[PDB]
Design an enzyme around this catalytic site. Structure first.
Site, PDB file in Angstrom:
ATOM      1  CG  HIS A 296      -5.561  -9.415  -0.062  1.00  0.00           C
ATOM      2  ND1 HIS A 296      -6.376  -8.470   0.525  1.00  0.00           N
ATOM      3  CD2 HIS A 296      -5.094  -8.853  -1.201  1.00  0.00           C
ATOM      4  CE1 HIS A 296      -6.400  -7.384  -0.227  1.00  0.00           C
ATOM      5  NE2 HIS A 296      -5.629  -7.590  -1.280  1.00  0.00           N
TER       6      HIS A 296
ATOM      7  CE  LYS B  42      -6.708   0.081   3.313  1.00  0.00           C
ATOM      8  NZ  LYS B  42      -6.796  -0.119   1.841  1.00  0.00           N
TER       9      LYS B  42
ATOM     10  NE  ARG C  80      -3.329  -2.619   2.619  1.00  0.00           N
ATOM     11  CZ  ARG C  80      -3.760  -3.238   3.713  1.00  0.00           C
ATOM     12  NH1 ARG C  80      -3.359  -2.833   4.909  1.00  0.00           N
ATOM     13  NH2 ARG C  80      -4.596  -4.262   3.611  1.00  0.00           N
TER      14      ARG C  80
ATOM     15  CE1 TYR D 214      -6.603  -4.652  -5.836  1.00  0.00           C
ATOM     16  CE2 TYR D 214      -4.741  -6.163  -6.000  1.00  0.00           C
ATOM     17  CZ  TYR D 214      -5.237  -4.877  -5.864  1.00  0.00           C
ATOM     18  OH  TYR D 214      -4.367  -3.815  -5.751  1.00  0.00           O
TER      19      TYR D 214
ATOM     20  CG  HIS E 240      -4.783   1.832  -4.502  1.00  0.00           C
ATOM     21  ND1 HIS E 240      -4.135   1.338  -3.391  1.00  0.00           N
ATOM     22  CD2 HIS E 240      -5.911   1.093  -4.637  1.00  0.00           C
ATOM     23  CE1 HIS E 240      -4.839   0.344  -2.877  1.00  0.00           C
ATOM     24  NE2 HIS E 240      -5.921   0.176  -3.615  1.00  0.00           N
TER      25      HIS E 240
ATOM     26  NE  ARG F  74      -2.513  -1.836  -2.429  1.00  0.00           N
ATOM     27  CZ  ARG F  74      -2.153  -2.916  -1.742  1.00  0.00           C
ATOM     28  NH1 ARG F  74      -0.870  -3.189  -1.550  1.00  0.00           N
ATOM     29  NH2 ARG F  74      -3.080  -3.725  -1.250  1.00  0.00           N
TER      30      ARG F  74
END
Lengths: 274, 267
Positions: free
Chosen positions: B244, B146, B123, B253, B219, B222
């Site tokens: 994850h 996060k 991130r 994703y 972003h 990623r």
DNA sequence: CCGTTGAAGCCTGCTTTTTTATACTAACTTGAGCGAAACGG
């Protein structure tokens, strides 16, 4: 007629007395009921509003005791749910509230800290040091450690009957912590020479000791050492948490679970190549 | 309720909009109509995502009100929530190099932060918080902010789809940049996360590109990183590196959203 | 090399097949007003 809150709480305690639970457990709920007594007026259940319930609840949340609010809210709710069963009221004005999420703030214990406490336990009697090494070599709970008799040891084993859960295990007298320098066998025999009683952990008078004094005196050696933490200073029960944390990197994780007395599963993982 | 700073600000931003769009009259007097009148007023302006957060925050405000003896029912749980599809496009490998060459006019740290955000797939916020002390024995211990999930990215990782090595890019930030943080500025000092992406948008529009809807962003590095890490090695690899754990977003994703057709080979 | 016959086509009422749920939690991203650093006179 025959209504009112208090009048019900009196007929409610007897109901829990027939539920068939542990002694200490029944006492925990009683202490919660008494708190509700001096927390809410004496009036019919149908008159009690959700506002007054949250007014008392939040009052304990602001004081810092958020954990207590959860049990008192979960217990007061059960009373009403059993009240409706009798036909007293029609709704549970407690199911409209929301329990305050509390985060555990009891710091853990490390290897360096334990060594600093064991040495500071010098001023303390000669059974505390033995209780420390034993609670870390067996990884058992303080409650059963006091009910351990020398008759439990059978042919190199250590039959332990957990009171809390009720799990039955047998810790062999061959274990040894490779980080502090303690041996299960050398620790047990050290208790037979120094102490000398019916129970593995006795007093200077050769008599069993309560589980409330084992962790009580441990606290004195905690504040006497002069170690600072973040939150609430660890306790004697933390020796159980430190035990597993060590055995997981000393032998295996499946071993720590079987030692503690667990059955089911329930930090810095590594990203393998495959 | 124990929040993570920023999240608290988000709520206040949604509450300040309600008091300006709804009278200060009694709660019980607040009908469901006057709640949908304001809600739909922001749905026609394209702010569909905003209407979803405003209704969700306003609805929870009443649940707490009912708990403290104020109202009996929530007239906000009766209205519908405006669905909003993601309009943000996805980045491709052939688009990455284009922006790479358009970042020449831009500072040096922009050409290193882009290569470090595609090789590690970390991130942006946790990319400008990594010190050189978080690298031991060839392992980069990264603690996300996060979710707060810790991981260890080995220096032995390189993308053959762009021609970049994590061991070559890392050392390229020790001489050029030089600082306490892997990604510093021209003043040997840390750089905010809300600026690293800013300088990335400039090269985007300057590179002269063309996408459908909302253009990509920093972003997206990623997303492209994981997209390449799924075909280069395996799927179980581009699932742990990103931090994850769930198995629900591993397929979301992976989507394309309508950029490049999912070329189906013999396999 | 005009007239009858049949593969198609839409209207309606079904009859299934793929996607997305509900909600706090925690960020990300493009303005715009603002204060200090750094270069031009």
């Amino acid at each position: 007629n025959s209504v009112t809150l208090h009048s019900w709480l009196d007929r409610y305690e007897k109901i829990l007395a027939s539920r068939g639970i542990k002694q200490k457990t029944l006492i925990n709920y009683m202490s919660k009921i008494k708190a509700i007594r001096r927390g809410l007026p004496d009036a019919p259940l149908e008159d009690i509003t959700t506002k007054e319930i949250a007014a008392m609840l939040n009052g304990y949340i602001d004081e810092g005791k958020a954990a207590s609010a959860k049990l008192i809210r979960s217990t007061l709710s059960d009373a009403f749910r059993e009240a409706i069963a009798e036909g007293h009221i029609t709704t549970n004005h407690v199911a409209a509230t929301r329990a305050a999420k509390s985060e555990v703030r009891r710091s853990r214990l490390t290897a360096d800290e334990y060594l600093k406490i064991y040495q500071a336990a010098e001023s303390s009697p000669c059974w505390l040091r033995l209780a420390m090494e034993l609670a870390v070599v067996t990884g058992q709970r303080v409650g059963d450690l006091c009910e351990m008799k020398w008759s439990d040891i059978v042919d190199g084993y250590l039959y332990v009957e957990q009171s809390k859960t009720g799990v039955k295990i047998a810790i062999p007298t061959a274990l040894h912590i490779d980080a502090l320098g303690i041996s299960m066998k050398e620790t047990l025999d050290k208790c037979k020479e120094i102490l000398g009683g019916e129970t593995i952990i006795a007093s200077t008078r050769r008599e069993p000791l309560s589980s409330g004094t084992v962790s009580r005196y441990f606290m004195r050696a905690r504040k006497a050492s002069g170690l600072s933490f973040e939150g609430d200073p660890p306790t004697f029960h933390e020796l159980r948490s430190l035990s597993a944390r060590l055995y997981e990197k000393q032998i295996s994780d499946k071993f720590a679970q079987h030692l503690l007395g667990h059955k089911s599963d329930t930090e810095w993982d590594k990203i393998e190549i495959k | 309720r124990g929040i993570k700073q920023k999240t608290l600000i988000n709520y206040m931003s949604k509450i300040k909009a309600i008091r300006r769009g709804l009278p200060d009259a009694p709660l019980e007097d607040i009908t469901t109509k006057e709640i949908a009148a304001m809600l739909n007023g922001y749905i026609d302006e394209g702010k569909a995502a905003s209407a979803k957060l405003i209704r969700s925050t306003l609805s929870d405000a009443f649940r707490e009100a009912i708990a403290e003896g104020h109202i009996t029912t929530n007239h906000v749980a009766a209205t519908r929530a405006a669905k909003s599809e993601v309009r943000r496009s996805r980045l491709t490998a052939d688009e990455y190099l284009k922006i790479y060459q358009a970042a020449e006019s831009s500072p040096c740290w922009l050409r290193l932060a882009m290569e470090l955000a595609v090789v590690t797939g970390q991130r942006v916020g946790d990319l400008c918080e990594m010190k050189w002390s978080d690298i031991v024995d060839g392992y980069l211990y990264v603690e996300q902010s996060k979710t707060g999930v810790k991981i260890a990215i080995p220096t032995a990782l390189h993308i053959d789809a762009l021609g970049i090595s994590m061991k070559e890019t890392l050392d390229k930030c020790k001489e050029i940049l030089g600082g306490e943080t892997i990604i510093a500025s021209t003043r040997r000092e840390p750089l905010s996360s809300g600026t690293v992406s800013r300088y990335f948008m400039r090269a985007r529009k300057a590179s002269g590109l063309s996408f459908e809807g909302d253009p990509p962003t920093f972003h997206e590095l990623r997303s492209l990183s994981a997209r390449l890490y799924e075909k280069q090695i395996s799927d179980k690899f581009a699932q742990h590196l990103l931090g994850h754990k769930s198995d629900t977003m591993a397929s979301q994703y992976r989507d394309d959203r309508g950029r490049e057709w999912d070329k189906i080979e013999i396999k």
